[PDB]
């Protein structure tokens, strides 16, 4: 009955938008184990761009989130079928290509962002007044 | 057997220092219920100073923290003996006076901060490079 959900990301400067997203993945089914994958510093900088917190800092914060059952840190940048079987992962949960193959196999669960909850956006707030 | 712990604060721009603190309060005893009190905007601004997030924003974040069992939002600024009996609170957990009476009654559990984990401190980081 227990469903294993895998949600990877940078999770830099974790904000309410991340937490709602993680909560959404966690609650995709009645009984889940949510695994969170945290990208490596070298690969984030190389593909997304600057990261503020290190791997260790990004990972320690996640362990304080109610919805997070297990963490893979660091995780691979691109999910592979081998990665799924390795970790017994039934569904990948990520915002919405790179995931065509996941959707084709029925294993893609879309989760949404919440705009404007960003740490960035809040410094703007204190700055904007 | 279950012990009720009460941890109040502003919890503005929640960072790893808050979460470790909350985790510490939660784990003060084997079986706890941790109640978190979130101060009101008007009273924080009036006593501590500027707050960045509103009550609602500060409170929504806390509900995503593993250690948080119940939230009182907003909470009173000064804890009273009546407040303890009202909510069946056995221990107040806060950093370390205002709490003499709590320590005198055996109901004060000290929890510690973690310096330099602040949101502030991280903007300094991105700014400092």
PDB file of C-alpha atoms in Angstrom:
ATOM      1  CA  UNK A   1       0.000   0.000   0.000  1.00  0.00           C
ATOM      2  CA  UNK A   2       2.904   2.391   0.700  1.00  0.00           C
ATOM      3  CA  UNK A   3       3.927   4.509  -2.326  1.00  0.00           C
ATOM      4  CA  UNK A   4       7.483   5.874  -2.727  1.00  0.00           C
ATOM      5  CA  UNK A   5       7.626   9.442  -4.115  1.00  0.00           C
ATOM      6  CA  UNK A   6      10.865  11.097  -5.269  1.00  0.00           C
ATOM      7  CA  UNK A   7      11.145  14.921  -5.348  1.00  0.00           C
ATOM      8  CA  UNK A   8      14.498  16.328  -6.435  1.00  0.00           C
ATOM      9  CA  UNK A   9      15.607  19.942  -6.583  1.00  0.00           C
ATOM     10  CA  UNK A  10      18.147  22.467  -5.407  1.00  0.00           C
ATOM     11  CA  UNK A  11      16.055  23.510  -2.371  1.00  0.00           C
ATOM     12  CA  UNK A  12      18.243  26.593  -2.010  1.00  0.00           C
ATOM     13  CA  UNK A  13      17.052  29.027   0.676  1.00  0.00           C
ATOM     14  CA  UNK A  14      13.956  26.927   1.424  1.00  0.00           C
ATOM     15  CA  UNK A  15      10.735  28.948   1.462  1.00  0.00           C
ATOM     16  CA  UNK A  16       6.989  28.355   1.823  1.00  0.00           C
ATOM     17  CA  UNK A  17       6.824  27.600  -1.896  1.00  0.00           C
ATOM     18  CA  UNK A  18       9.162  24.620  -1.452  1.00  0.00           C
ATOM     19  CA  UNK A  19       7.316  23.395   1.602  1.00  0.00           C
ATOM     20  CA  UNK A  20       3.898  23.494  -0.076  1.00  0.00           C
ATOM     21  CA  UNK A  21       5.400  21.653  -3.034  1.00  0.00           C
ATOM     22  CA  UNK A  22       6.890  18.991  -0.759  1.00  0.00           C
ATOM     23  CA  UNK A  23       3.603  18.716   1.147  1.00  0.00           C
ATOM     24  CA  UNK A  24       1.872  18.231  -2.198  1.00  0.00           C
ATOM     25  CA  UNK A  25       4.170  15.401  -3.242  1.00  0.00           C
ATOM     26  CA  UNK A  26       3.877  13.798   0.202  1.00  0.00           C
ATOM     27  CA  UNK A  27       0.063  13.791  -0.019  1.00  0.00           C
ATOM     28  CA  UNK A  28      -0.113  12.483  -3.577  1.00  0.00           C
ATOM     29  CA  UNK A  29      -1.412   9.196  -2.091  1.00  0.00           C
ATOM     30  CA  UNK A  30      -2.826   8.115   1.281  1.00  0.00           C
ATOM     31  CA  UNK A  31       0.287   6.190   2.377  1.00  0.00           C
ATOM     32  CA  UNK A  32       3.619   7.496   1.055  1.00  0.00           C
ATOM     33  CA  UNK A  33       7.303   7.645   1.718  1.00  0.00           C
ATOM     34  CA  UNK A  34       8.610  10.917   0.272  1.00  0.00           C
ATOM     35  CA  UNK A  35      12.278  10.861  -0.754  1.00  0.00           C
ATOM     36  CA  UNK A  36      13.853  14.255  -1.375  1.00  0.00           C
ATOM     37  CA  UNK A  37      16.913  14.519  -3.614  1.00  0.00           C
ATOM     38  CA  UNK A  38      19.239  17.480  -3.109  1.00  0.00           C
ATOM     39  CA  UNK A  39      21.430  18.454  -6.013  1.00  0.00           C
ATOM     40  CA  UNK A  40      25.190  18.747  -5.704  1.00  0.00           C
ATOM     41  CA  UNK A  41      26.873  22.140  -5.517  1.00  0.00           C
ATOM     42  CA  UNK A  42      29.062  21.548  -8.547  1.00  0.00           C
ATOM     43  CA  UNK A  43      26.147  20.428 -10.734  1.00  0.00           C
ATOM     44  CA  UNK A  44      23.707  23.145  -9.668  1.00  0.00           C
ATOM     45  CA  UNK A  45      26.304  25.862 -10.288  1.00  0.00           C
ATOM     46  CA  UNK A  46      27.109  24.205 -13.613  1.00  0.00           C
ATOM     47  CA  UNK A  47      23.501  23.861 -14.857  1.00  0.00           C
ATOM     48  CA  UNK A  48      21.075  26.116 -12.929  1.00  0.00           C
ATOM     49  CA  UNK A  49      23.485  28.749 -11.625  1.00  0.00           C
ATOM     50  CA  UNK A  50      24.763  30.260  -8.400  1.00  0.00           C
ATOM     51  CA  UNK A  51      23.625  28.553  -5.204  1.00  0.00           C
ATOM     52  CA  UNK A  52      23.600  30.420  -1.899  1.00  0.00           C
ATOM     53  CA  UNK A  53      23.657  27.586   0.609  1.00  0.00           C
ATOM     54  CA  UNK A  54      26.000  24.612   0.321  1.00  0.00           C
ATOM     55  CA  UNK A  55      24.830  21.032  -0.072  1.00  0.00           C
ATOM     56  CA  UNK A  56      25.156  20.441   3.678  1.00  0.00           C
ATOM     57  CA  UNK A  57      23.190  23.582   4.564  1.00  0.00           C
ATOM     58  CA  UNK A  58      20.488  22.892   1.982  1.00  0.00           C
ATOM     59  CA  UNK A  59      20.192  19.331   3.289  1.00  0.00           C
ATOM     60  CA  UNK A  60      20.106  20.127   7.012  1.00  0.00           C
ATOM     61  CA  UNK A  61      17.132  22.444   6.516  1.00  0.00           C
ATOM     62  CA  UNK A  62      15.146  19.794   4.630  1.00  0.00           C
ATOM     63  CA  UNK A  63      15.478  17.365   7.528  1.00  0.00           C
ATOM     64  CA  UNK A  64      13.307  19.763   9.583  1.00  0.00           C
ATOM     65  CA  UNK A  65      10.358  19.574   7.135  1.00  0.00           C
ATOM     66  CA  UNK A  66       7.360  17.530   8.265  1.00  0.00           C
ATOM     67  CA  UNK A  67       6.739  16.022   4.859  1.00  0.00           C
ATOM     68  CA  UNK A  68      10.303  14.760   4.263  1.00  0.00           C
ATOM     69  CA  UNK A  69      10.740  11.066   5.069  1.00  0.00           C
ATOM     70  CA  UNK A  70      14.108  10.302   3.505  1.00  0.00           C
ATOM     71  CA  UNK A  71      16.806  12.366   1.854  1.00  0.00           C
ATOM     72  CA  UNK A  72      19.282  11.464  -0.886  1.00  0.00           C
ATOM     73  CA  UNK A  73      22.089  14.009  -0.674  1.00  0.00           C
ATOM     74  CA  UNK A  74      23.604  14.581  -3.021  1.00  0.00           C
ATOM     75  CA  UNK A  75      21.284  13.188  -5.703  1.00  0.00           C
ATOM     76  CA  UNK A  76      21.991  12.753  -9.415  1.00  0.00           C
ATOM     77  CA  UNK A  77      21.080  15.614 -11.667  1.00  0.00           C
ATOM     78  CA  UNK A  78      19.025  13.623 -14.201  1.00  0.00           C
ATOM     79  CA  UNK A  79      16.766  10.822 -13.026  1.00  0.00           C
ATOM     80  CA  UNK A  80      17.346   7.509 -14.763  1.00  0.00           C
ATOM     81  CA  UNK A  81      15.260   4.319 -14.952  1.00  0.00           C
ATOM     82  CA  UNK A  82      18.138   2.631 -13.105  1.00  0.00           C
ATOM     83  CA  UNK A  83      17.783   5.216 -10.349  1.00  0.00           C
ATOM     84  CA  UNK A  84      14.085   4.365  -9.973  1.00  0.00           C
ATOM     85  CA  UNK A  85      14.644   0.627  -9.627  1.00  0.00           C
ATOM     86  CA  UNK A  86      17.640   1.218  -7.371  1.00  0.00           C
ATOM     87  CA  UNK A  87      15.502   3.118  -4.805  1.00  0.00           C
ATOM     88  CA  UNK A  88      12.128   1.402  -5.422  1.00  0.00           C
ATOM     89  CA  UNK A  89      10.655   4.737  -6.601  1.00  0.00           C
ATOM     90  CA  UNK A  90       7.096   4.566  -7.980  1.00  0.00           C
ATOM     91  CA  UNK A  91       6.536   8.221  -8.915  1.00  0.00           C
ATOM     92  CA  UNK A  92       8.716  11.252  -9.592  1.00  0.00           C
ATOM     93  CA  UNK A  93       7.175  14.509  -8.327  1.00  0.00           C
ATOM     94  CA  UNK A  94       8.497  17.710  -9.914  1.00  0.00           C
ATOM     95  CA  UNK A  95       7.148  20.927 -11.361  1.00  0.00           C
ATOM     96  CA  UNK A  96       6.240  20.946 -15.064  1.00  0.00           C
ATOM     97  CA  UNK A  97      10.742  17.415 -22.265  1.00  0.00           C
ATOM     98  CA  UNK A  98      13.087  15.928 -19.645  1.00  0.00           C
ATOM     99  CA  UNK A  99      10.106  14.114 -18.086  1.00  0.00           C
ATOM    100  CA  UNK A 100       8.396  12.767 -21.218  1.00  0.00           C
ATOM    101  CA  UNK A 101       9.806   9.309 -20.476  1.00  0.00           C
ATOM    102  CA  UNK A 102       8.493   9.548 -16.898  1.00  0.00           C
ATOM    103  CA  UNK A 103       5.033  10.614 -18.037  1.00  0.00           C
ATOM    104  CA  UNK A 104       5.067   7.901 -20.707  1.00  0.00           C
ATOM    105  CA  UNK A 105       5.634   5.258 -18.013  1.00  0.00           C
ATOM    106  CA  UNK A 106       2.871   6.689 -15.808  1.00  0.00           C
ATOM    107  CA  UNK A 107       5.388   7.732 -13.150  1.00  0.00           C
ATOM    108  CA  UNK A 108       5.205  11.534 -13.304  1.00  0.00           C
ATOM    109  CA  UNK A 109       3.216  13.454 -10.700  1.00  0.00           C
ATOM    110  CA  UNK A 110       3.111  17.180 -11.363  1.00  0.00           C
ATOM    111  CA  UNK A 111       3.490  19.565  -8.401  1.00  0.00           C
ATOM    112  CA  UNK A 112       3.092  23.346  -8.506  1.00  0.00           C
ATOM    113  CA  UNK A 113       5.050  26.338  -7.215  1.00  0.00           C
ATOM    114  CA  UNK A 114       3.697  29.248  -5.162  1.00  0.00           C
ATOM    115  CA  UNK A 115       4.880  32.535  -6.636  1.00  0.00           C
ATOM    116  CA  UNK A 116       6.164  35.412  -4.523  1.00  0.00           C
ATOM    117  CA  UNK A 117       6.945  33.468  -1.328  1.00  0.00           C
ATOM    118  CA  UNK A 118      10.646  33.591  -2.175  1.00  0.00           C
ATOM    119  CA  UNK A 119      13.333  34.644   0.259  1.00  0.00           C
ATOM    120  CA  UNK A 120      14.428  37.006  -2.514  1.00  0.00           C
ATOM    121  CA  UNK A 121      10.931  38.446  -2.653  1.00  0.00           C
ATOM    122  CA  UNK A 122      10.965  39.161   1.073  1.00  0.00           C
ATOM    123  CA  UNK A 123      14.263  41.060   1.017  1.00  0.00           C
ATOM    124  CA  UNK A 124      12.603  43.121  -1.712  1.00  0.00           C
ATOM    125  CA  UNK A 125       9.828  43.704   0.828  1.00  0.00           C
ATOM    126  CA  UNK A 126      12.130  45.024   3.553  1.00  0.00           C
ATOM    127  CA  UNK A 127      14.044  46.884   0.854  1.00  0.00           C
ATOM    128  CA  UNK A 128      10.860  48.225  -0.807  1.00  0.00           C
ATOM    129  CA  UNK A 129       9.978  50.023   2.466  1.00  0.00           C
TER     130      UNK A 129
ATOM    131  CA  UNK B   1       3.369  10.277  30.138  1.00  0.00           C
ATOM    132  CA  UNK B   2       2.904  12.949  27.439  1.00  0.00           C
ATOM    133  CA  UNK B   3       4.522  16.316  28.300  1.00  0.00           C
ATOM    134  CA  UNK B   4       3.212  19.613  26.859  1.00  0.00           C
ATOM    135  CA  UNK B   5       5.973  22.076  25.867  1.00  0.00           C
ATOM    136  CA  UNK B   6       5.282  25.711  24.932  1.00  0.00           C
ATOM    137  CA  UNK B   7       7.771  27.636  22.740  1.00  0.00           C
ATOM    138  CA  UNK B   8       6.813  31.204  21.864  1.00  0.00           C
ATOM    139  CA  UNK B   9       8.623  33.651  19.618  1.00  0.00           C
ATOM    140  CA  UNK B  10       8.363  35.858  16.574  1.00  0.00           C
ATOM    141  CA  UNK B  11       9.647  33.139  14.200  1.00  0.00           C
ATOM    142  CA  UNK B  12      10.231  35.813  11.566  1.00  0.00           C
ATOM    143  CA  UNK B  13      11.978  34.530   8.425  1.00  0.00           C
ATOM    144  CA  UNK B  14      12.376  31.030   9.888  1.00  0.00           C
ATOM    145  CA  UNK B  15      15.913  29.664   9.592  1.00  0.00           C
ATOM    146  CA  UNK B  16      17.896  26.597  10.676  1.00  0.00           C
ATOM    147  CA  UNK B  17      18.501  28.266  14.034  1.00  0.00           C
ATOM    148  CA  UNK B  18      14.755  28.322  14.745  1.00  0.00           C
ATOM    149  CA  UNK B  19      14.297  24.763  13.580  1.00  0.00           C
ATOM    150  CA  UNK B  20      17.101  23.389  15.761  1.00  0.00           C
ATOM    151  CA  UNK B  21      15.633  25.303  18.691  1.00  0.00           C
ATOM    152  CA  UNK B  22      12.171  23.868  18.033  1.00  0.00           C
ATOM    153  CA  UNK B  23      13.646  20.381  17.612  1.00  0.00           C
ATOM    154  CA  UNK B  24      15.378  20.869  20.956  1.00  0.00           C
ATOM    155  CA  UNK B  25      12.170  21.810  22.746  1.00  0.00           C
ATOM    156  CA  UNK B  26      10.309  18.940  21.068  1.00  0.00           C
ATOM    157  CA  UNK B  27      12.904  16.414  22.289  1.00  0.00           C
ATOM    158  CA  UNK B  28      13.088  17.741  25.840  1.00  0.00           C
ATOM    159  CA  UNK B  29      11.264  14.543  26.914  1.00  0.00           C
ATOM    160  CA  UNK B  30      10.532  11.166  25.302  1.00  0.00           C
ATOM    161  CA  UNK B  31       6.823  11.854  24.695  1.00  0.00           C
ATOM    162  CA  UNK B  32       5.873  15.495  24.064  1.00  0.00           C
ATOM    163  CA  UNK B  33       3.342  17.740  22.455  1.00  0.00           C
ATOM    164  CA  UNK B  34       5.139  20.914  21.356  1.00  0.00           C
ATOM    165  CA  UNK B  35       2.939  24.018  21.178  1.00  0.00           C
ATOM    166  CA  UNK B  36       4.417  26.961  19.297  1.00  0.00           C
ATOM    167  CA  UNK B  37       3.177  30.476  20.044  1.00  0.00           C
ATOM    168  CA  UNK B  38       3.545  33.109  17.331  1.00  0.00           C
ATOM    169  CA  UNK B  39       3.558  36.712  18.428  1.00  0.00           C
ATOM    170  CA  UNK B  40       1.173  39.275  16.991  1.00  0.00           C
ATOM    171  CA  UNK B  41       2.356  41.833  14.454  1.00  0.00           C
ATOM    172  CA  UNK B  42       1.319  44.815  16.540  1.00  0.00           C
ATOM    173  CA  UNK B  43       3.081  43.542  19.672  1.00  0.00           C
ATOM    174  CA  UNK B  44       6.299  42.441  17.968  1.00  0.00           C
ATOM    175  CA  UNK B  45       6.626  45.794  16.191  1.00  0.00           C
ATOM    176  CA  UNK B  46       5.851  47.514  19.491  1.00  0.00           C
ATOM    177  CA  UNK B  47       8.355  45.566  21.640  1.00  0.00           C
ATOM    178  CA  UNK B  48      11.007  43.780  19.527  1.00  0.00           C
ATOM    179  CA  UNK B  49      10.873  45.872  16.358  1.00  0.00           C
ATOM    180  CA  UNK B  50      10.187  45.590  12.647  1.00  0.00           C
ATOM    181  CA  UNK B  51       8.884  42.229  11.453  1.00  0.00           C
ATOM    182  CA  UNK B  52       9.290  41.155   7.835  1.00  0.00           C
ATOM    183  CA  UNK B  53       6.598  38.517   7.487  1.00  0.00           C
ATOM    184  CA  UNK B  54       3.054  38.995   8.760  1.00  0.00           C
ATOM    185  CA  UNK B  55       1.455  36.828  11.422  1.00  0.00           C
ATOM    186  CA  UNK B  56      -0.200  34.660   8.762  1.00  0.00           C
ATOM    187  CA  UNK B  57       3.047  34.177   6.826  1.00  0.00           C
ATOM    188  CA  UNK B  58       5.074  33.466   9.962  1.00  0.00           C
ATOM    189  CA  UNK B  59       2.441  30.947  11.055  1.00  0.00           C
ATOM    190  CA  UNK B  60       2.031  29.119   7.740  1.00  0.00           C
ATOM    191  CA  UNK B  61       5.755  28.360   7.621  1.00  0.00           C
ATOM    192  CA  UNK B  62       5.754  26.886  11.135  1.00  0.00           C
ATOM    193  CA  UNK B  63       3.054  24.395  10.179  1.00  0.00           C
ATOM    194  CA  UNK B  64       5.600  22.777   7.817  1.00  0.00           C
ATOM    195  CA  UNK B  65       8.103  22.041  10.630  1.00  0.00           C
ATOM    196  CA  UNK B  66       8.371  18.415  11.738  1.00  0.00           C
ATOM    197  CA  UNK B  67       8.671  19.257  15.407  1.00  0.00           C
ATOM    198  CA  UNK B  68       5.585  21.513  15.612  1.00  0.00           C
ATOM    199  CA  UNK B  69       2.510  19.728  16.969  1.00  0.00           C
ATOM    200  CA  UNK B  70       0.166  22.619  17.693  1.00  0.00           C
ATOM    201  CA  UNK B  71       0.255  26.340  17.059  1.00  0.00           C
ATOM    202  CA  UNK B  72      -1.268  29.220  19.018  1.00  0.00           C
ATOM    203  CA  UNK B  73      -1.429  32.171  16.636  1.00  0.00           C
ATOM    204  CA  UNK B  74      -1.398  34.810  17.716  1.00  0.00           C
ATOM    205  CA  UNK B  75      -0.085  34.111  21.224  1.00  0.00           C
ATOM    206  CA  UNK B  76       0.160  36.522  24.156  1.00  0.00           C
ATOM    207  CA  UNK B  77       3.369  38.434  24.523  1.00  0.00           C
ATOM    208  CA  UNK B  78       4.050  37.570  28.183  1.00  0.00           C
ATOM    209  CA  UNK B  79       3.288  34.099  29.486  1.00  0.00           C
ATOM    210  CA  UNK B  80       1.078  34.028  32.558  1.00  0.00           C
ATOM    211  CA  UNK B  81       0.305  31.281  35.091  1.00  0.00           C
ATOM    212  CA  UNK B  82      -3.289  31.484  33.831  1.00  0.00           C
ATOM    213  CA  UNK B  83      -2.014  30.809  30.321  1.00  0.00           C
ATOM    214  CA  UNK B  84      -0.245  27.653  31.528  1.00  0.00           C
ATOM    215  CA  UNK B  85      -3.307  26.195  33.233  1.00  0.00           C
ATOM    216  CA  UNK B  86      -5.509  27.251  30.326  1.00  0.00           C
ATOM    217  CA  UNK B  87      -3.470  25.146  27.842  1.00  0.00           C
ATOM    218  CA  UNK B  88      -2.246  22.398  30.221  1.00  0.00           C
ATOM    219  CA  UNK B  89       1.372  23.518  29.641  1.00  0.00           C
ATOM    220  CA  UNK B  90       4.000  21.757  31.783  1.00  0.00           C
ATOM    221  CA  UNK B  91       7.166  23.512  30.582  1.00  0.00           C
ATOM    222  CA  UNK B  92       8.004  26.748  28.784  1.00  0.00           C
ATOM    223  CA  UNK B  93      10.944  26.395  26.373  1.00  0.00           C
ATOM    224  CA  UNK B  94      12.721  29.627  25.419  1.00  0.00           C
ATOM    225  CA  UNK B  95      16.248  30.933  25.080  1.00  0.00           C
ATOM    226  CA  UNK B  96      17.880  32.418  28.189  1.00  0.00           C
ATOM    227  CA  UNK B  97      14.406  38.083  34.549  1.00  0.00           C
ATOM    228  CA  UNK B  98      11.095  37.564  32.720  1.00  0.00           C
ATOM    229  CA  UNK B  99      11.393  33.807  33.360  1.00  0.00           C
ATOM    230  CA  UNK B 100      12.455  33.809  37.024  1.00  0.00           C
ATOM    231  CA  UNK B 101       8.913  32.840  38.030  1.00  0.00           C
ATOM    232  CA  UNK B 102       8.973  29.998  35.480  1.00  0.00           C
ATOM    233  CA  UNK B 103      12.327  28.715  36.704  1.00  0.00           C
ATOM    234  CA  UNK B 104      11.154  29.061  40.309  1.00  0.00           C
ATOM    235  CA  UNK B 105       8.203  26.756  39.568  1.00  0.00           C
ATOM    236  CA  UNK B 106      10.432  24.216  37.802  1.00  0.00           C
ATOM    237  CA  UNK B 107       8.752  24.910  34.458  1.00  0.00           C
ATOM    238  CA  UNK B 108      11.555  26.548  32.464  1.00  0.00           C
ATOM    239  CA  UNK B 109      13.498  24.532  29.898  1.00  0.00           C
ATOM    240  CA  UNK B 110      16.336  26.480  28.320  1.00  0.00           C
ATOM    241  CA  UNK B 111      16.926  26.110  24.563  1.00  0.00           C
ATOM    242  CA  UNK B 112      19.845  27.561  22.601  1.00  0.00           C
ATOM    243  CA  UNK B 113      20.264  29.505  19.362  1.00  0.00           C
ATOM    244  CA  UNK B 114      22.622  28.681  16.485  1.00  0.00           C
ATOM    245  CA  UNK B 115      24.519  31.791  15.434  1.00  0.00           C
ATOM    246  CA  UNK B 116      25.083  32.749  11.807  1.00  0.00           C
ATOM    247  CA  UNK B 117      22.337  30.615  10.222  1.00  0.00           C
ATOM    248  CA  UNK B 118      20.191  33.720   9.794  1.00  0.00           C
ATOM    249  CA  UNK B 119      18.466  34.664   6.571  1.00  0.00           C
ATOM    250  CA  UNK B 120      20.137  38.044   7.077  1.00  0.00           C
ATOM    251  CA  UNK B 121      23.502  36.331   7.324  1.00  0.00           C
ATOM    252  CA  UNK B 122      22.955  34.550   4.019  1.00  0.00           C
ATOM    253  CA  UNK B 123      22.092  37.709   2.078  1.00  0.00           C
ATOM    254  CA  UNK B 124      25.376  39.018   3.476  1.00  0.00           C
ATOM    255  CA  UNK B 125      26.931  35.904   1.935  1.00  0.00           C
ATOM    256  CA  UNK B 126      25.568  36.534  -1.559  1.00  0.00           C
ATOM    257  CA  UNK B 127      26.325  40.218  -1.049  1.00  0.00           C
ATOM    258  CA  UNK B 128      29.831  39.544   0.348  1.00  0.00           C
ATOM    259  CA  UNK B 129      30.768  37.863  -2.971  1.00  0.00           C
TER     260      UNK B 129
END
